[PDB]
Design an enzyme around this catalytic site. Sequence first.
Site, PDB file in Angstrom:
ATOM      1  N   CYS A 202      60.715  26.939  77.707  1.00 12.36           N
ATOM      2  CA  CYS A 202      61.529  27.178  78.892  1.00 12.36           C
ATOM      3  C   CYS A 202      62.750  26.265  78.887  1.00 12.36           C
ATOM      4  O   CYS A 202      62.616  25.061  78.633  1.00 12.36           O
ATOM      5  CB  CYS A 202      60.706  26.951  80.158  1.00 12.36           C
ATOM      6  SG  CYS A 202      61.628  27.176  81.697  1.00 12.36           S
TER       7      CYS A 202
ATOM      8  N   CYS B  78      61.870  23.866  82.454  1.00  9.46           N
ATOM      9  CA  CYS B  78      60.624  23.112  82.508  1.00  9.46           C
ATOM     10  C   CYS B  78      60.250  22.519  81.155  1.00  9.46           C
ATOM     11  O   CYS B  78      59.640  21.446  81.102  1.00  9.46           O
ATOM     12  CB  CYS B  78      59.491  24.005  83.017  1.00  9.46           C
ATOM     13  SG  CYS B  78      58.016  23.111  83.557  1.00  9.46           S
TER      14      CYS B  78
ATOM     15  N   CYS C  92      57.700  31.773  82.292  1.00  2.89           N
ATOM     16  CA  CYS C  92      57.173  30.419  82.390  1.00  2.89           C
ATOM     17  C   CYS C  92      56.256  30.342  83.605  1.00  2.89           C
ATOM     18  O   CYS C  92      56.691  30.596  84.733  1.00  2.89           O
ATOM     19  CB  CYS C  92      58.306  29.400  82.503  1.00  2.89           C
ATOM     20  SG  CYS C  92      57.773  27.732  82.953  1.00  2.89           S
TER      21      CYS C  92
ATOM     22  N   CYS D 231      57.482  27.463  86.276  1.00  2.00           N
ATOM     23  CA  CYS D 231      58.749  27.572  86.984  1.00  2.00           C
ATOM     24  C   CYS D 231      59.181  28.997  87.292  1.00  2.00           C
ATOM     25  O   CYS D 231      60.064  29.181  88.136  1.00  2.00           O
ATOM     26  CB  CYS D 231      59.871  26.884  86.190  1.00  2.00           C
ATOM     27  SG  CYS D 231      59.993  25.102  86.471  1.00  2.00           S
TER      28      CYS D 231
ATOM     29  N   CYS E  71      19.780  32.038  33.507  1.00  2.00           N
ATOM     30  CA  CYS E  71      19.028  30.956  32.880  1.00  2.00           C
ATOM     31  C   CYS E  71      17.654  30.825  33.529  1.00  2.00           C
ATOM     32  O   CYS E  71      17.564  30.710  34.754  1.00  2.00           O
ATOM     33  CB  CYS E  71      19.785  29.636  32.997  1.00  2.00           C
ATOM     34  SG  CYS E  71      18.898  28.199  32.353  1.00  2.00           S
TER      35      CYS E  71
ATOM     36  N   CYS F  75      17.598  26.809  35.428  1.00  2.00           N
ATOM     37  CA  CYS F  75      18.427  26.506  36.588  1.00  2.00           C
ATOM     38  C   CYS F  75      18.918  27.742  37.326  1.00  2.00           C
ATOM     39  O   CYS F  75      19.125  27.678  38.541  1.00  2.00           O
ATOM     40  CB  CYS F  75      19.633  25.657  36.174  1.00  2.00           C
ATOM     41  SG  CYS F  75      20.861  26.525  35.180  1.00  2.00           S
TER      42      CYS F  75
ATOM     43  N   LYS G 283      22.855  36.607  17.463  1.00  2.00           N
ATOM     44  CA  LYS G 283      22.681  37.974  17.945  1.00  2.00           C
ATOM     45  C   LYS G 283      21.358  38.590  17.496  1.00  2.00           C
ATOM     46  O   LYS G 283      20.748  39.354  18.251  1.00  2.00           O
ATOM     47  CB  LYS G 283      23.850  38.844  17.485  1.00  2.00           C
ATOM     48  CG  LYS G 283      23.995  40.138  18.267  1.00  2.00           C
ATOM     49  CD  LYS G 283      25.454  40.470  18.529  1.00  2.00           C
ATOM     50  CE  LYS G 283      25.605  41.852  19.142  1.00  2.00           C
ATOM     51  NZ  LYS G 283      24.746  42.019  20.347  1.00  2.00           N
ATOM     52  N   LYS G 284      20.897  38.283  16.279  1.00  2.00           N
ATOM     53  CA  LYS G 284      19.699  38.950  15.770  1.00  2.00           C
ATOM     54  C   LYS G 284      18.446  38.476  16.497  1.00  2.00           C
ATOM     55  O   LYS G 284      17.510  39.257  16.704  1.00  2.00           O
ATOM     56  CB  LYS G 284      19.560  38.745  14.258  1.00  2.00           C
ATOM     57  CG  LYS G 284      19.285  37.318  13.817  1.00  2.00           C
ATOM     58  CD  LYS G 284      19.260  37.180  12.301  1.00  2.00           C
ATOM     59  CE  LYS G 284      18.019  37.822  11.701  1.00  2.00           C
ATOM     60  NZ  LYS G 284      17.936  37.603  10.230  1.00  2.00           N
ATOM     61  N   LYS G 285      18.403  37.204  16.890  1.00  2.97           N
ATOM     62  CA  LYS G 285      17.268  36.657  17.620  1.00  2.97           C
ATOM     63  C   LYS G 285      17.427  36.751  19.130  1.00  2.97           C
ATOM     64  O   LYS G 285      16.488  36.410  19.855  1.00  2.97           O
ATOM     65  CB  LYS G 285      17.041  35.193  17.231  1.00  2.97           C
ATOM     66  CG  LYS G 285      17.402  34.854  15.798  1.00  2.97           C
ATOM     67  CD  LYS G 285      17.005  33.425  15.464  1.00  2.97           C
ATOM     68  CE  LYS G 285      17.730  32.922  14.229  1.00  2.97           C
ATOM     69  NZ  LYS G 285      17.664  31.440  14.114  1.00  2.97           N
TER      70      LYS G 285
ATOM     71  N   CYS H 157      22.230  27.992  27.917  1.00  2.00           N
ATOM     72  CA  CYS H 157      22.873  27.840  29.214  1.00  2.00           C
ATOM     73  C   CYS H 157      24.052  26.882  29.115  1.00  2.00           C
ATOM     74  O   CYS H 157      23.986  25.857  28.432  1.00  2.00           O
ATOM     75  CB  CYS H 157      21.871  27.334  30.249  1.00  2.00           C
ATOM     76  SG  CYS H 157      22.545  27.188  31.913  1.00  2.00           S
TER      77      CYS H 157
ATOM     78  N   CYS I 195      23.047  23.644  31.927  1.00  7.57           N
ATOM     79  CA  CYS I 195      21.987  22.677  31.676  1.00  7.57           C
ATOM     80  C   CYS I 195      21.577  22.614  30.208  1.00  7.57           C
ATOM     81  O   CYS I 195      20.620  21.904  29.880  1.00  7.57           O
ATOM     82  CB  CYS I 195      20.765  22.986  32.548  1.00  7.57           C
ATOM     83  SG  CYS I 195      19.883  24.498  32.109  1.00  7.57           S
TER      84      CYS I 195
HETATM   85 ZN   LIG Z   1      59.736  26.539  82.840  1.00  9.47          ZN
HETATM   86 ZN   LIG Z   2      20.513  26.602  32.882  1.00 10.26          ZN
END
Ligand SMILES: [Zn+2]
Ligand SMILES: [Zn+2]
Lengths: 98, 49, 117, 196, 77, 92
Positions: free
Chosen positions: F4, F7, F20, F23, F63, F66, F76-78, F83, F86
């Site tokens: 204002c 005011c 306002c 006022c 995992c 955890c 890859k074969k096994k 993780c 951990c």
């Molecule tokens: Zn005012």
């Molecule tokens: Zn883990």
Amino acid sequence: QVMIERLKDSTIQISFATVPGRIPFAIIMRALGFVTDRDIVYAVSLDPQIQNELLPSLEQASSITSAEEALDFIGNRVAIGQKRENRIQKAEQVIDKY
Amino acid sequence: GVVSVEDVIRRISEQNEDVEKYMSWSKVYLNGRLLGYYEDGKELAKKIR
Amino acid sequence: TLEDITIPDEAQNEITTKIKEGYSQVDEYIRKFNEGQLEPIPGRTIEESLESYILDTLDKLRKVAGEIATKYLDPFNNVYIMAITGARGSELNITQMTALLGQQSVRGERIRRGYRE
Amino acid sequence: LGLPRLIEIVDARKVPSTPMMTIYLTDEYKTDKDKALDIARRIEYTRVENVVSSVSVDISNMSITLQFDQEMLKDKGVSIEEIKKIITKLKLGEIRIEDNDEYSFTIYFEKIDSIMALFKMREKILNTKIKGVKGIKRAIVQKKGDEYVIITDGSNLEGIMNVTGVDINKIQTNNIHEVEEVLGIEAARELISREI
Amino acid sequence: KIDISNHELVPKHEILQLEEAYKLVKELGIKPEQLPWIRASDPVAKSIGAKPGDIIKITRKSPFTGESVTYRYVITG
Amino acid sequence: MRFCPKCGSFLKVKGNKMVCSKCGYSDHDVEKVILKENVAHENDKTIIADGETIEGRVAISLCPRCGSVRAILLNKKKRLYRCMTCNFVYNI
Ligand SMILES: [Zn+2]
Ligand SMILES: [Zn+2]
């Protein structure tokens, strides 16, 4: 130590040692001589985006309009249960020392 | 050359300074207390050094 | 003795070339991240998947370098005897003493805490 | 895991610190990825804020605008129409919804007065549940052999036992008190030995 | 509501005849309440209709003997 | 955000006017103020843990120890995994 929090209500609350509760930011700012909302807003920041986040805090202290009212609000916590002339001076002498 | 906070606020309010002018200015702190505003803070740091 | 953990110059050259290849792979990952062509891993953000890719690449680099160092060392020196028989030491110790330490980590992450960025 | 988990087991805590379930599926849901994904979709607990990308609060006319992430909205299997229906059932009062786009709408609050109540309404809206079984915080589909298994971040034996397609004779939990209450004490002690 | 006796964590429960329970408690040299207890409101106790004062014969799976037999005494609660 | 001119208090939008409350001042200029918050869903999709590599040897696999979904396909074969949280070695 002085701690300042922001709640889920988007309101900022001030809390220091010798007062048990949390005082709104605008109430504690009015007791320090910042009477109008414009003074508080421009003292916080000049960025419109920053100062648009003070609207919830301003309305929480819409009832308080002068320094004496804010000092009475603080004295209601500092010294409850006495006349409304030693509360103001007690709040003044706490806010100036701690 | 650092302009205080009160001076900047008075320039914006009492005069007709643009708020966007001081949004591009650097903030200057002394021991963690905001001290004022400065236009190019990099050369201020350079000249202090 | 100190010659039980010293590799010849050709082994060091091979390790250096492998390190260069690993660094090139890491740089390619970083470039793909910078150009927005990096796919994330489910449940993790980007710049968190890039760290996983980098860690995997560096772990594989350490394993390959250890294999090279073992290949170009005498299989009958006393450190190897102490390791394979189970007296003291492992293959990670030999790799770190002869090829490279690898990536150091704090709580599973690379070393980051310091200055800004 | 480790010593804190062992202490949890031997101190007989009512609820574990990290509950977990392993959910097996029936033969017809066993080897299909889409069906397992559908089950995981319909058992996971989802709120409104889990599909909202941006929230806009307007002070001028007391209106809250919601923007929805299309990818998340598709992933959860949720539609905007059912979200509107759920919000309509709330306690908010006399409201008015208007579409602003194909993935947006605004609640206009023709009654509210202040900003405190506007915000309180905003966090009341953002916490509203859309779907899912209570207690299930996250579901993960895992392929073990030729079978698809659902791994859960929360625990609810009673709720999951009522879900369609769940193998109720193979369901696993690490909450020993729920297993004692539902299956008995011998199952509870078998689970205790397995956990230790 | 739901049949749980077919779950893989649940061993076989059987109510024991009075003569067999009497012989068991005589040859163990105990009172019936010195066995481990099972509540009458247990989910598997209700499935077989067990009343307090009965003895339940439970067969569990073991990695050392294959099958292991255990006895529980039905209490009130 | 507007204040204002007399005011000093902030002005709120009522109809076509900004008034306002203290006022009673009014004006013909209307400024809209909104508060916009953003929610990020970078890591909120549904995970499907099949031991398939994405980049290099990094695969998505749960995992047994955890429970993290980050793994390194060691062989890859096994179907041998490790993780990344951990260092637990397992088979899936
Ligand atoms: Zn005012
Ligand atoms: Zn883990």
